Amino acid sequence: VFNATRFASVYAWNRKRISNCVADYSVLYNSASFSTFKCYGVSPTKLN
Amino acid sequence: FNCYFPLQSYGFQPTNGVGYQPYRVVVLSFELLHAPATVCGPKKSTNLV
16 A cells, blocks of 8 residues: 555545454654654554 | 654634533642641531530
8 A cells, every 4th residue: 555556646535445364563663764644542653 | 754743732713612622620629637737617616515
């Protein structure tokens, strides 16, 4: 999703379901390759 | 980059809702039967027997 080859339009926004696996978010918070990162209700690093 | 100023202000204005308007809070704490008394209430003492 974050590194997709060709994204979709805005009216044609794609959705990808994720489940039954582990998700390492700490690598994203420390990636330093994003213009903005905002999490509502929960801290970004507390997602782990 | 991942650094934030923890101090933020309140939106106390005359147009916001009661969920945001300023509420003058006054928290009264005290200890009871822990030391000799200093404060008392509007009472009337009397003689001894």
